[PDB]
Structure formats: C-alpha cells, structure tokens
C-alpha cells in the first residue's frame, strides 16, 4: 500500500517540479532578454564614445 503511494507521490511531485521549473524558465527568459539588449547597448556606447573623439 505504501509503495504504491510512494511511487504515486513521486509522480505527483515531479509533475509539480516541472511546473516550478517552467516558471523559472520564463523568469530567466525575461532576464536573458533584458541582459541581451543591455550588452548591445553598452558595447555600442563604447564604440560611439570612440567615434565621437
């Protein structure tokens, strides 16, 4: 009775895990995207500063 409950619990738990991980994927995706824009901009600023001189 226990063993079935345990393996069942693992199924339930691992399902909830995937969901929690998905949320983190989305959160870090926004972070990635923001960071990506920032790199382009910050690099661009260095180039511009040089060109201006």
């Amino acid at each position: 009775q226990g063993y079935a409950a345990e393996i069942s619990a693992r199924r339930n738990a691992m399902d909830n895990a995937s969901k929690n991980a998905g949320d983190m994927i989305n959160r870090y995706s926004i972070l990635y995207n923001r960071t990506r824009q920032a790199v382009i901009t910050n690099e661009l600023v260095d180039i511009i500063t040089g060109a201006s001189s």
């Binding site: 690099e43 180039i47 060109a51």
Partner: protein
C-alpha cells in the same frame, strides 16, 4: 632554356603612352593612401601606384581620393605617382579557369600559366531580377545521405553551413565537391556543376591541403579555387567573394550549372570591418561596419536559378558561417541567417559523440528543401523525417521502466542515427543512398545489432551489387521507384537481412 624564357620576358617589355592621371600621395597610414590628383576617378576604380601596388577608391572625397592599398604599406610611400589603370574591378571570366588556383586578381598562385578567359567582367554586376528567374526544380546531390534526404539541396538556392569553429566545416563542404565528380564525368551539361570553392582568409597551409585533396580526388577539372589567404590584404579579402561570384556568373550566363561555396563570410565580414574602420566610415553594431548587412545581402543575392527565357542555368551557393560559441544571436550570424534560404547547422556535441557528418537535424532546415529532392529518394524518406523527429523527443527517455512504444522508438532511432554516420571524404551515390534508407524505413535494420550496423551497410551494398545491380541500374536511370521496384527492394532487404 632559363635564358630563353628570361629573354622572352625582357623582349615582352616595350614602350608606353601618356599616364592619364598622376596622383601624389598626401599621407599613407594604415593602408589608406589619401591621394591628391585622380580628378576623373571612377568609383572603386583600379589604380596603380609607383610601387606597382594596386588599389581601389572606396572614398571619393571632395579633394582627395582615398585609395585603399591592395598591397602592404611598406612598398607605398608619400608623394608617389598614382597612375590610373582606368578599369573598375574586373577579373577574367571564361572557361579556362577550371582547374586553376587563382587569387583575386586572377594571377595563378599555383603557376598554371596565363589564364584563358573569354571576358573580364566587373565584380559589381547586379543580380538577376524577379522575373529573370524560374523556380528551383533541379536537385544537386551531395553524396551525403543525411544532407540529401534530411535537407535536400536544389539549384540556384542558398543554404548555410553555419556551425561551430573548426568542426572541419570545410570537410562537410568538400564532400559535396567530391560527389560532383560522378555527375561531372557524364557528358550532359544538365549533369555538370562546375564547382568554385572560395577560400576566404584561409591559411596557405589549409589551401595546400585543399589543393592536394582536390587533386587527389581528381576534382580539378571542374573546380576553381579562388584563394584569398590569411596574408592577403583586406581589400583582397573584401573583394574575394565578389570576384568569385563573377566567375560563377560566366558559367551561369552560359546557362550551365555550378556550385559556389563561399567559405567563410565571417572572414569576409572581418575584412569589411577592417576597411571601414580604417577608412573612418561610420562604425556600427558589434563593431562591424554599418553597411555589413548590405554587403552580405549583395553577395548572397547573386545566386540564382535562371528563367527559361534566360535559358535556365543556375549558380547554386552554399555560404559557410562560423559561429563563435554557437551564437546565432551574434550580429553577423543573424544577418546571414535572415538573408539565406535554409540553414544546415553542424553541432559540436554530435561531432564529439562521433556522429560525422555532425549535422544537427533539428537545427538544419531547408526552405527550398524537398522541392528539389530526387523522386525516388523523396518516396523512401518521408518516414525517415518523422522517425528521427520522434527519436529526438524520446531521446531523454533513454535514462529503465520504459514503455514498449518508447522502446520501439529507441531501437529504431538508435539504428537510424548509426546509419547516418558516414566516413568523411567518401561520397555515396544516390543509387546507393536509396537502398540503405529503404531498409531503415522498413525497419529491418531495427533487428540488426548496433555494433553491426557499420558492417551491415557495406555488406548490404555489396550484396545488392552482386544480387541485382540491375535493380540499382534501374533505380539510377528511372529515378522513380515503381511498385515492382519497391516490392523487389523490400524482398531484397529481407533476403539480405536473412544472411
């Protein structure tokens, strides 16, 4: 005699006429001579210095004409006469350039004597329009089973070979050139792709390897190697794909077929960057010149499958882009990816996992694709696309208590993956592609042990050749698998599996 050849050469010098426009260098730094004179200069015209250095005139400024030296700065010096050659950048184009390793100027860097050429055509010639083309309908087989089936290659179309650094990117390409020997041997001009390999920024050691491999596989007699080596300067590097394209255009203009492989535009990018930054032209994204999009787009649109009014011809192209850390995000990759029509994405992990070609099927796409697939090969490999797709999804399930369905997928998938391994620099004829894939499709290979897949393959081929090379000859010539052939083929696979 050594005396006689020298005597001919001295004899071949004699007299001259008025040097139309002299210049005097004002300042020469960074290979950017800024010349006072050359009043009537044409844009990007070829100009000859006192030192004999040649240049182009990218900037025609309101009082100075900014020549860019094709040569080293050492030879040029201030106040030099700058004679005006008076001919905009043009390179000999003709039929004789086959089996001639030439640099951008067209000078044989292998000393295979003066170029035989039927025209000198400008390297700035603009691509054929909307209506001067007719949609792709002619395959080009590469002799790589995966390329030919998973991402079929047509004519006049362009697809990337975009992948991780020094994964023997050139090897994947070189294989295609080798397979063109089979079709080349034939007399039909339909069956003649005259390949051009454009070695951009490639070290002379690499070009020596290139030269020997091509000679070894007897490929030189439809090959041209336009060579702009690492040493060769940034104007040459810049104009190197442009020059190459013009050579291709002559073949295309004759209505023939050819395949021009630009390897790699990443080094082309660097050269334009060098030119622009040094000419103080406005910089842009990722410190690549502002008009880098414009450069790449100009080159890549030259490739065209011509219309029947223009007596259908082609200039199939295969640009190679080297990804830096696999970043498709990077500015030069993003631009090229957008411009091209399909990508083949080689993947380092696969290479390490011994899959060679290390093409990552997922990240390989063709936007022309199956439109120019051999009909026979199309028939026997719709299934293959779906199976591999499933194999990818069920890949992670390879860690115990696994459903029978998943396990079925795994067996079929693993065997297929093993089947698509190929020993690089050996191309495989379509008439031998078709049987192997048929077996896999019919899942008779599922039974064969993983270790024995390699042995099975060669054995099946020899068995087919012994058992019925009539079938093979039929496959080759009919090119369309009749029900009787598909029947016979299934039987043959079964029989072979039994032994």
């Amino acid at each position: 005699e050594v005396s006689s050849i020298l005597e001919e050469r001295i004899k071949g010098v004699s007299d001259e006429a008025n040097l139309n426009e002299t210049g005097r260098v004002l300042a020469v730094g960074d290979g950017i001579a800024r010349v006072f004179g050359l009043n009537n200069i044409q844009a990007e015209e070829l100009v000859e210095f006192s030192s004999g250095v040649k240049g182009m005139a990218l900037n025609l400024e309101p009082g100075q004409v900014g020549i860019v030296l094709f040569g080293s700065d050492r030879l040029v010096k201030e106040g030099e006469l700058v004679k005006r050659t008076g001919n905009i950048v043009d390179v000999p184009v003709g039929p004789g350039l086959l089996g001639r390793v030439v640099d951008a100027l067209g000078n044989p860097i292998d000393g295979k004597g003066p170029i035989d050429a039927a025209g000198r055509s400008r390297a700035q010639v603009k691509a054929p329009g909307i209506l001067p083309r007719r949609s792709v309908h002619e395959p080009v087989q590469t002799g790589l089973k995966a390329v030919d089936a998973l991402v079929p290659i047509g004519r006049g179309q362009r697809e990337l070979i975009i992948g991780d650094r020094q994964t023997g990117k050139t090897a994947v390409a070189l294989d295609t050139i080798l397979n063109q020997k089979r079709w080349n041997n034939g007399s039909d001009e339909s069956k003649k792709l005259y390949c051009v390999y454009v070695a951009v920024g490639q070290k002379r050691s690499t070009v020596a390897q290139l030269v020997q491999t091509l000679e070894q596989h007897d490929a030189m007699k439809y090959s041209i190697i336009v060579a702009a080596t690492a040493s060769e300067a940034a104007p040459l590097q810049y104009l190197a794909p442009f020059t190459a394209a013009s050579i291709g255009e002559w073949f295309r203009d004759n209505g023939k077929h050819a395949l021009i492989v630009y390897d790699d535009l990443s080094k082309q990018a660097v050269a334009y960057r060098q030119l622009s930054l040094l000419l103080r032209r406005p910089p842009g994204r990722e410190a690549y010149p502002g008009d880098v999009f414009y450069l790449h787009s100009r080159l890549l649109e030259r490739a065209a499958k011509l219309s029947e009014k223009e007596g259908s011809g082609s200039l199939t192209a295969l640009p190679v882009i080297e990804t830096q850390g696999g970043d498709v995000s990077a500015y030069i990759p993003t631009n090229v990816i957008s411009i091209t029509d399909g990508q083949i994405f080689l993947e380092a992990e696969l290479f390490y996992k011994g899959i060679r070609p290390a093409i990552n099927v997922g990240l390989s796409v063709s936007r022309v694709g199956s439109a120019a697939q051999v009909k026979a090969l199309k028939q026997v490999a719709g299934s293959l696309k779906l199976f591999l797709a499933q194999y990818r999804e069920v890949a992670a399930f390879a860690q115990s208590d696994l459903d029978a369905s998943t396990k079925q997928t795994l067996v079929r998938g693993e065997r297929l993956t093993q089947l698509l391994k190929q020993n690089q620099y050996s191309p495989l004829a379509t008439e031998e592609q078709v049987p192997l894939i048929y077996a896999g499709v019919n899942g008779h290979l599922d039974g064969i042990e993983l270790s024995r897949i390699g042995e099975f393959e060669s054995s099946f081929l020899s068995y087919l050749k012994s058992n019925h090379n009539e079938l093979l000859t039929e496959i080759r010539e009919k090119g369309e698998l009749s029900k009787e052939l598909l029947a016979s083929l299934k039987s043959a696979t079964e029989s072979f599996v039994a032994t």
